[PDB]
Design a protein around this ligand. Structure first.
Ligand SMILES: *C(=N)c1ncc(C(=O)NCc2ccccc2)cn1
Length: 239
């Protein structure tokens, strides 16, 4: 399991869209951070609302998608896959990005991490997946912050019947125990299980052995690399 950078994660999301068209393949460059992921999601869901009323979108067009295609995505999507790039040190979005840029040139992970927040529009579910279990803060604190965020989302994107957005913390233990490179791949793997089954408890079923579980993850990665080989580069699928 090598390191999955943003480009490979994007591709894999593109591919994921062609399998599960309700997933919008949100760009990972520049990615969401722990400082702006809320605002980014709110802005996406507001643009979705505009699209449903035939109105103009306000928020920014993706770099690799036409206006027209982005409207159709927004109309069809039932699932926002938000990839969050974390490092413990930077204390602002701009610093986070600078650190991200810096760590690319040094060509190491360092202490950097990817997190996944799934905004499941259909189930009305916020799903927080950290393969390190508590790299950003404890799961219980993160749950509480997300229950707050989930209430803003009830106001921003109301349901027909006022069903409230619920929050699940995906990882109950450290998932990527004996690997410091696998966090992108884990995030895509967890995503894929979730698409296959949103009622998944795939994480609970994992083999206890850290080697076994990363062998399986490696197969996963090979299957995806094979599956996206011929797909266009830097190019959203057409919704
Ligand atoms: C998870 N194990 C993991 N997450 C993030 C990185 C990382 O960001 N490395 C530096 C980098 C490479 C390419 C583009 C931007 C940043 C590594 N590992």
């Amino acid at each position: 399991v090598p390191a999955w950078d943003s480009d490979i994660i994007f591709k894999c999301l593109c591919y994921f869209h062609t399998l599960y068209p309700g997933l919008i393949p949100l760009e990972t460059f520049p990615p969401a951070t722990i400082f702006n992921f809320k605002q980014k999601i709110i802005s996406i869901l507001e643009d979705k609302k505009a699209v449903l009323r035939g109105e103009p979108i306000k928020g920014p067009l993706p770099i690799c998608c036409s206006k027209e295609n982005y409207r159709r995505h927004l109309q069809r999507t039932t699932l926002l896959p938000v990839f969050m790039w974390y490092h413990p040190t930077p204390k602002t979005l701009s610093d986070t990005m600078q650190t991200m840029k810096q760590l690319a040139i040094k060509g190491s992970v360092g202490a950097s991490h990817w997190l996944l927040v799934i905004v499941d529009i259909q189930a009305r579910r916020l799903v927080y997946f950290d393969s390190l279990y508590n790299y950003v803060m404890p799961p219980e604190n993160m749950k509480k912050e997300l229950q707050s965020f989930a209430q803003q989302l009830d106001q921003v994107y109301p349901a027909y019947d006022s069903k409230k957005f619920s929050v699940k913390i995906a990882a109950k233990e450290v998932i990527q125990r004996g690997s410091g490179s696998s966090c992108g791949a884990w995030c895509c793997q967890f995503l894929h299980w979730y698409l296959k089954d949103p009622l998944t408890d795939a994480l609970n079923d994992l083999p206890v052995d850290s080697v076994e579980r990363h062998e399986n993850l490696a197969s996963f990665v090979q299957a995806c690399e094979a599956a996206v080989q011929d797909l266009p580069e830097l190019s959203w699928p057409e919704a």
